[PDB]
Design a protein around this ligand. Sequence first.
Ligand code: XQ0
Ligand code: XQ0
Lengths: 208, 208
Amino acid sequence: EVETFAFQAEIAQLMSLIINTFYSNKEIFLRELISNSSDALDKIRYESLTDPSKLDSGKELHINLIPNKQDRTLTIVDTGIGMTKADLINNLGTIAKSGTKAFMEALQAGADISMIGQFGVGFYSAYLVAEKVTVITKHNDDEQYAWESSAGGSFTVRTDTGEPMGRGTKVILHLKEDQTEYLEERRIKEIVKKHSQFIGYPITLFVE
Amino acid sequence: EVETFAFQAEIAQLMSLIINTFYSNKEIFLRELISNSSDALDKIRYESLTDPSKLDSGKELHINLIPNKQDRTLTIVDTGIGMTKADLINNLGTIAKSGTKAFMEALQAGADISMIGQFGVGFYSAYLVAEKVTVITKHNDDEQYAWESSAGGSFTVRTDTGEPMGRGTKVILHLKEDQTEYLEERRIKEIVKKHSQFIGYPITLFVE
Ligand SMILES: Cc1n[nH]c2cc(O)ccc12
Ligand SMILES: Cc1n[nH]c2cc(O)ccc12
């Protein structure tokens, strides 16, 4: 029922660099995850231009931000293209091996961590705040999967029989104990307004 | 042999806004076209991860910048995924209708033209310097096409029997008479170094 995989060596180093580098500007994780969602929404929209029935699984194109102080999770949900099982395994649809190379040679030439999305690996910036990330996903061409990792070199994949979601991707951030400021309405609002002001899909900040 | 099309009304307004607005920071056209090329190179690279024979049409992943003072053209060539005929017609592979909407509502809320790539329509920033743009393209799944437009509401598409290119996209900028600074080695170098410093594909600036 549960398959366990090793990260390729370069992605493992990336996750370790993100987890271990002292670096105060952690809030960028939210800009990078919203921009990933917006990329995935563009994709299903582009496809729908020539095949309308692609949107049979959900016509609404949006992003929701769901904080939960009980479980200490911040959840980012989008109704984008979603990912097939193969995509989840190939580093959540990214060119993460070459992306990490470029990001590392940029760090060598005086870039800082906030430029991580330039290299196609901004997803891994989740590990600035999250001790565990769970990705639930559904692409039209495949069934619903759950990916999970607490870093340390491996991730799991399983077919997900949780809440049927129609089409898209939920990123569930299980926050580090010292990072619960990102569950605060006010703090989330400020970040979105600061870094994601002109995203072309409605972003709804849920309240508790 | 030559088919002629009308731009959708929103893309037509976008091109007219770009052509007619007084706006001095024109050099951004090069950052936006290099970032489009880099997106297209990511795509063929991602595909090759699961199907290696996708790279049968060219294993090299690069970007070349070719100025020519005789014809007054600056050419951007990439060996990315390239575009099918359908893609050329659907606004060169972009979600240009909704992208223009978002870009326009951003201009209303105090964004400036340099943020155009945030909305998926940075290609049209070519019309800051070019009186005519010619796009030659070859995607693995289709034959080689030429798209052309001098704006004014229409574009052409034809199967291209010019120089067989293997796989990718050439954007040929026929520069406005007052914009030949972009044919200067020194000026091109400065722009690339300023705006495209950390692109993960080698960029070669050709010399004359
Ligand atoms: C990767 C990745 N991070 N966040 C995402 C959201 C998506 O909808 C698809 C992929 C990703
Ligand atoms: C659109 C567009 N502008 N420049 C490009 C280069 C490409 O390789 C593909 C698409 C575009």
